């Protein structure tokens, strides 16, 4: 088999993009210039949900903000999070750490390249096509479990930078914290007690923070391929950093709405995990990105999930009544990753 990177694809001197990488005739007519789509400021917007509160003493101040974060949910299930508790300087050193990382020349990365043949799915990859229409998105990816500290696999982290370990630990172990204020919050909202969505999703112990570098190299027909393809996030929570490149788009009632870049925020969505655990109540959004002719773009998303097999995940019992019936059958996470796995692959078939 031959190993092809998109950056590599991008630097190689192509004009045109490969017909792979060329959306479906149907899908090309949403795809328009990102630069001019993040200029347009009509229309429903993404929410920012400001966070200082979260956990204040001042019960109405903390319970406006639990309700505000409740509505966001409920309606997009994806928003800009300020005051999030997370250093400024932090995530600062983490995204320098990664833009080093990805700096390097293809090769240098190689040496960390993944090998899903034999399970190793960690480490440096590109989406390799997995169905009959042999589709590829324009991103090439790091992707490495970041907490809990005991069950990573270090060996496979970037070490160059020499404090891309550093960084990416200290941000990881940040970010678990503010997902239990989240977790405890949300819970709140469905008026279940603090600690039942993150116990759900198996708690301090079990819930694993995965890290993927998504790297999108300039494209030099962005308008007829995606940074990555529409699809909605497994996860229980993502959060997500951006290097002020605009790319992420949200369908939201039936349009594709750019996401603005606003300083020092995360973008956090809510994911499959918790839509199911709600009922459909909070909302896992459909999005995708694109890509552009002008400027390299890199995100950093980390993924809160349920551990694997360990648990089998539904609507809990108190969503879920004769009034209001059950809308997902019982699954595991990785079943449910195979099952959208699998509607795909027959609908290209
Ligand atoms: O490779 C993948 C993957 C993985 O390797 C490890 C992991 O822990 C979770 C994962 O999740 C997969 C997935 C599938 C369909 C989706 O809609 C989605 O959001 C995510 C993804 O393809
Ligand atoms: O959206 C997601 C995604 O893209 C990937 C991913 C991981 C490894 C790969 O090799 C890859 O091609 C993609 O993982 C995820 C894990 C989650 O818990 C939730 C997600 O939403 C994603
Ligand atoms: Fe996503």
Do not use: F, T
């Given at each position: 088999v031959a190993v092809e990177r998109v950056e590599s694809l991008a630097k190689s001197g192509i004009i045109s993009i490969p017909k792979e990488y060329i959306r479906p005739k149907e899908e090309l007519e949403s795809i328009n210039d990102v630069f001019l789509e993040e200029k347009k400021e009509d229309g429903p917007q993404v929410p920012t949900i400001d966070l200082?509160?979260?956990?204040?003493?001042?019960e109405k101040i903390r319970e406006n903000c639990i309700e505000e974060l409740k509505k966001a949910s409920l309606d997009w299930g994806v928003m800009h999070l300020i005051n999030?508790?997370?250093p400024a300087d932090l995530m600062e050193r983490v995204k320098k750490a990664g833009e080093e990382f990805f700096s390097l020349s293809v090769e240098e990365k190689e040496k960390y390249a993944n090998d899903q043949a034999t399970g190793?799915?960690?480490?440096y990859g590109s989406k390799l096509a997995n169905n009959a229409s042999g589709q590829l998105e324009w991103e090439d990816y790091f992707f490495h479990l970041a907490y809990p500290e005991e069950k990573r696999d270090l060996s496979i982290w970037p070490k160059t930078p020499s404090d891309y370990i550093e960084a990416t630990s200290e941000y990881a172990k940040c970010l678990r914290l503010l997902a239990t204020k989240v977790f405890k919050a949300l819970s709140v909202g469905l008026g279940?007690?603090?600690?039942?969505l993150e116990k759900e999703v198996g708690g301090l112990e079990e819930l694993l923070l995965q890290m993927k570098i998504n790297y999108y190299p300039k494209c030099?027909?962005?308008?007829?391929?995606?940074?990555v393809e529409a699809h909605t996030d497994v996860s229980a929570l993502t959060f997500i950093l951006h290097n002020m490149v605009p790319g992420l788009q949200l369908f939201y009632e039936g349009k594709w709405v750019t996401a603005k870049c606003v300083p020092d925020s995360i973008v956090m969505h809510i994911g499959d995990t918790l839509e199911i655990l709600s009922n459909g109540k909070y909302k896992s959004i459909l999005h995708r990105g694109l890509v552009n002719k002008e400027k390299v773009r890199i995100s950093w998303a980390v993924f809160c999930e349920p551990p694997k097999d360990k648990i089998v995940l539904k609507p809990l019992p108190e969503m879920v009544s004769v009034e209001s019936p059950a809308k997902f059958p019982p699954r595991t996470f990785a079943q449910h990753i195979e099952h959208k796995l699998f509607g795909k692959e027959q609908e290209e078939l």
């Open positions: 200082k509160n979260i956990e204040s003493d001042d999030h508790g997370i190793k799915i960690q480490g279940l007690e603090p600690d039942r030099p027909q962005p308008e007829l391929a995606l940074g």
